[PDB]
C-alpha cells in the first residue's frame, strides 16, 4: 500500500549514493594541486551606469557583449550601451516588482517578470519608435524568479510556485511543465546546446531538466540552505551552485555528485549570483556583504575581490566573449569590470 | 564627433524622463497590506476614499499606494525584501476568529515574524482589529479563554478587546525604535482613512528630520 512505497524509496536513495561513492576515486583538489596557481586577479571599474532609482535585481547581458538590459523596482527596463554608457531604451513596466529580466539571443525581444506572476515580452524592433509589449505569459501561481531565452519563440520560466514551465510566444500556452521540486525555484541556467537546463530551488537541491521531454534528468544535493544562484559550465557537463549560506558548490553532470566546495571562514553571508569566465576557470559570485568574490574554479582559492558597491550585489554575469564583467547591486548602479 | 551627439541626446532625454518619474514617485506613499486569511482585508480596501494587487487612493492631496500580497502563496522570506523602505505596513486582524491551528494564533504568529523582521526594523505598523461588531456578540456566548488559556478578565467587550490588543502589542521586541498603531474598526467605520493618514504623518515627520540631519 502506502507504507512499502517509502521503504523502497529509501532503498533506491541508498543505491544512488552507493553508486556515487563507487565512481569517486580522487577529488578535483588532488588532481589540480600540481598545476600552477592562477595568482592574484586585479579588476577595475571601467563603466558606471547610473539612472536607476531603485534596487537592481536583473542584469542579463546581450549576445553582442555590448548591449545590457537591467531591471529595478522603479518599474523601468533600461537597455544600456556599455561601450558608451548611453541608454538605448527605457521601457516602463505595468508592475514595478520585477525580479528578473532576459535578453533574447537575436536581440529583438526582452522579457521580464516578478510578483505579478506574469512574464511580459517586449518587442524592441517595431515600425514605431517605441517599445511595446508583445505577449503576457499567464498561468503561474507564484512570483517570477527566472526567465531565459532559447530562441525567439521559446522561453523557460522559473516561478515561485515550485514548478518550471516552457512557454510559447505566438501562442500564450505552456508547451511543457516541469514538476518535481519541493520548494520555490529561484534561478535557472541554460546549456549552450539549449537541450538541458538546471534549476535551483529552496530545498537545497538542483535538478537537471530536459526541455523536449519535460522531465527531470538528475537531482543534485549537498547544500544546507536555499539556492539563489546557478550558472552552467561552457562544457555543458558541469554547473555551479550558489546557496543562501556562504558556500558555493560545483557539480558534475556525468559524475552526478559534488565536485569542489568554495567556502571561506570570513564569509557568512549568502550568494545571490554566480557566473563563469570564458574558459570556466574563474567562478564569480556575488554576496550579501556588498562585495563580489572571484574564485578559482579548479583550486577553490580566492583569486580576487571586487569591492565597488555600497549595497548587496544582487545580479552578476559575464559577457559572451568574457572580456568584461558587469555587476549590479541594490545601490541602483551598474559597474563594468575589466583586467589590466 | 557628428554622431556621438545623436546617441547622447537620445540618452540624455531618457534621464530627463527618469528624473521626472522618480520625483513623482518620491512624493507618493507606499502601504503594505499584510493581513492573514482575509481578516477583514476587503472591508478596509473599500473604505479608503493576480499575484499582487495595487490600490491607489487620494486623501488630503496625498497619493497612497496599497500593495496586497495575499495571493502570492509562496515563501515570504524570498520576496519580503522587495518591500524594504515602505512607509508603513497595514495589518488586518479579525476579532471574530478567536473561536475558529487557531485562526487568531496564526495571526499573531505571522505578525511576530513580520514585526520582528530584519527588513522591517524601524517601519511603522498599523494594526486594524476589524469585525468588532461580531466580536461583541460572540464574546457574550463564547469566552475568550478558548483562545487564550491565561485570560483572567470577564467577558466584557471593552477589556476583552483591550486584552487582545495588548498581546499583539507585546509581540514586538523593538519598542524603543518602532511604534504600532492599533485601531478598532467595523464595516460602518469612516475614520479608517484618517487613522492611516495620521499614522503616516509621523513617518513623513520622521523622514523630514532625517533629511536635515536631526535624526
Amino acid at each position, epitope marked *: 500500500e502506502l507504507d512499502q512505497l517509502r521503504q523502497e524509496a529509501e532503498q533506491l536513495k541508498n543505491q544512488i549514493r552507493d553508486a556515487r561513492k563507487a565512481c569517486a576515486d580522487a577529488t578535483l583538489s588532488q588532481i589540480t594541486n600540481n598545476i600552477d596557481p592562477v595568482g592574484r586577479i586585479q579588476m577595475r571599474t571601467r563603466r558606471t551606469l547610473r539612472g536607476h532609482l531603485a534596487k537592481i535585481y536583473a542584469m542579463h547581458w546581450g549576445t553582442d557583449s555590448r548591449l545590457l538590459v537591467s531591471a529595478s523596482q522603479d518599474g523601468k527596463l533600461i537597455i544600456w550601451d556599455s561601450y558608451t554608457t548611453n541608454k538605448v531604451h527605457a521601457i516602463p513596466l505595468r508592475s514595478s516588482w520585477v525580479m528578473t529580466c532576459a535578453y533574447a539571443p537575436s536581440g529583438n525581444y526582452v522579457a521580464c517578470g516578478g510578483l505579478d506572476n506574469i512574464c511580459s515580452i517586449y518587442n524592441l524592433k517595431t515600425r514605431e519608435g517605441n517599445v511595446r509589449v508583445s505577449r503576457e505569459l499567464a498561468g503561474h501561481t507564484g512570483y517570477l524568479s527566472c526567465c531565459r531565452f532559447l530562441d525567439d519563440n521559446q522561453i523557460v520560466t522559473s516561478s515561485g510556485d515550485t514548478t518550471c514551465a516552457l512557454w510559447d510566444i505566438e501562442t500564450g500556452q505552456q508547451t511543457t511543465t516541469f514538476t518535481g521540486h519541493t520548494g520555490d525555484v529561484m534561478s535557472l541556467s541554460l546549456a549552450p546546446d539549449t537541450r538541458l537546463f538546471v534549476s535551483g530551488a529552496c530545498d537545497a537541491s538542483a535538478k537537471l531538466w530536459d526541455v523536449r521531454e519535460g522531465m527531470c534528468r538528475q537531482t543534485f544535493t549537498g547544500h544546507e540552505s536555499d539556492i539563489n544562484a546557478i550558472c552552467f559550465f561552457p562544457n555543458g557537463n558541469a554547473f555551479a551552485t550558489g546557496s543562501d549560506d556562504a558556500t558555493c558548490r560545483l557539480f558534475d553532470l556525468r559524475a552526478d555528485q559534488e565536485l569542489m566546495t568554495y567556502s571561506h571562514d570570513n564569509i557568512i553571508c549568502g550568494i545571490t549570483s554566480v557566473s563563469f569566465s570564458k574558459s570556466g576557470r574563474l567562478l564569480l559570485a556575488g554576496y550579501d556583504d556588498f562585495n563580489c568574490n572571484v574564485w578559482d574554479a579548479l583550486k577553490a582559492d580566492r583569486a580576487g575581490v571586487l569591492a565597488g558597491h555600497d549595497n548587496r550585489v544582487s545580479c552578476l554575469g559575464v559577457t559572451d566573449d568574457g572580456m568584461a564583467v558587469a555587476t549590479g547591486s541594490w545601490d541602483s548602479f551598474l559597474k563594468i569590470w575589466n583586467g589590466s | 564627433s557628428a554622431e556621438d551627439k545623436a546617441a547622447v*541626446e537620445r540618452s540624455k532625454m531618457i534621464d530627463r524622463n527618469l528624473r521626472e518619474d522618480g520625483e513623482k514617485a518620491a512624493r507618493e506613499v507606499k502601504l503594505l497590506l499584510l493581513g492573514a486569511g482575509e481578516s477583514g482585508k476587503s472591508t478596509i480596501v473599500k473604505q479608503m476614499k493576480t499575484g499582487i494587487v495595487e490600490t491607489h487612493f487620494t486623501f488630503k492631496d496625498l497619493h497612497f499606494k496599497m500593495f496586497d500580497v495575499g495571493g502570492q502563496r509562496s515563501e515570504r522570506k524570498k520576496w519580503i525584501h522587495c518591500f524594504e523602505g515602505v512607509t508603513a505596513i497595514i495589518f488586518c486582524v479579525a476579532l471574530s476568529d478567536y473561536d475558529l491551528m487557531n485562526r487568531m494564533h496564526e495571526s499573531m504568529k505571522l505578525f511576530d515574524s513580520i514585526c520582528n523582521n530584519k527588513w522591517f526594523t524601524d517601519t511603522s505598523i498599523i494594526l486594524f482589529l476589524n469585525k468588532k461588531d461580531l466580536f461583541e456578540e460572540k464574546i457574550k456566548k463564547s469566552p475568550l479563554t478558548i483562545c487564550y488559556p491565561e485570560y483572567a478578565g470577564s467577558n466584557t467587550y471593552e477589556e476583552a478587546a483591550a486584552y487582545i490588543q495588548c498581546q499583539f502589542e507585546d509581540l514586538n521586541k523593538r519598542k524603543d525604535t518602532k511604534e504600532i498603531y492599533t485601531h478598532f474598526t467595523c464595516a460602518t467605520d469612516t475614520k479608517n482613512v484618517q487613522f492611516v493618514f495620521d499614522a503616516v504623518t509621523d513617518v513623513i515627520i520622521k523622514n523630514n528630520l532625517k533629511d536635515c540631519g536631526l535624526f
Partner: single-chain antibody
Amino acid sequence: DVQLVESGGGLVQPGGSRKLSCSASGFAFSSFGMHWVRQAPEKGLEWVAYISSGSGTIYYADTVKGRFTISRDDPKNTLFLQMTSLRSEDTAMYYCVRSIYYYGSSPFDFWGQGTTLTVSSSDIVMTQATSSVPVTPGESVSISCRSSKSLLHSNGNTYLYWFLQRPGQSPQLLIYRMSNLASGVPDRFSGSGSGTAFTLTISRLEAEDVGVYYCMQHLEYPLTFGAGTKLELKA
C-alpha cells in the same frame, strides 16, 4: 501603418513666403528626428534641415541658412518648414524623412510622399559612377561610390547610406552603414566598401529594381547625396 503626408505647396512668387506641413501618423513622432530633403526637377536629392527628437538640436544647409527655419509640433504630430525669401532655385519636391537612433545608426527608413513647390521667375563630396547603365533581368549590377573624405570613423562605423528612388515613388532606404540591410529589402542587395570607395551589388535583378540609386554620407551633417545612377531595362 507609418504615414507621412506633405501639404502646403504650389505656385509661389519670388521673394514670397510659404510653410510646409508634414503630418505624421502610425508611429511615435516625438521620439523620431525629422529631416527635410528636396529633389529639383530632373535632378538629385539634397538635404535641407534637421530637427532633433527634443528640438534641442537644429541644423540647416548652407544654401537655406537664415531664410529657412524648421519646427515640429509633437502633440499634433506635425512637422513645419517655414520659408522666407523664396528663390527660383528652391523649386523642388520636399520630403520629410523620419530618423531615430536605430541599430547603432541613424537610418532614413521612411520617406514622405512629397509636395510640389514651384517658384516661377569642407563639405564631403560623394562622386557616383556613370549616371546610366543598361541592364536586363537576371544579371548582376555593381554601382560604385567615391567619397572625398574617409567615411570610416574611429568607432569602426562607416556612415554610408544607400537609397532607391523608383519612378514616381519616394526614395527608400536599402543599406545603412554600408553593411546593414534595411527592413523589407530583399537579400539581393549587398553593400561593400573600405574608407572612400564603396560598392552596392544586386545579385538577382528584378523589374521592380528600376530607379535611381543615391548614396549619402552621415559622417558630417552636412549630408551630401551623390549624382545618382539610373537603372533602365534594355529594349
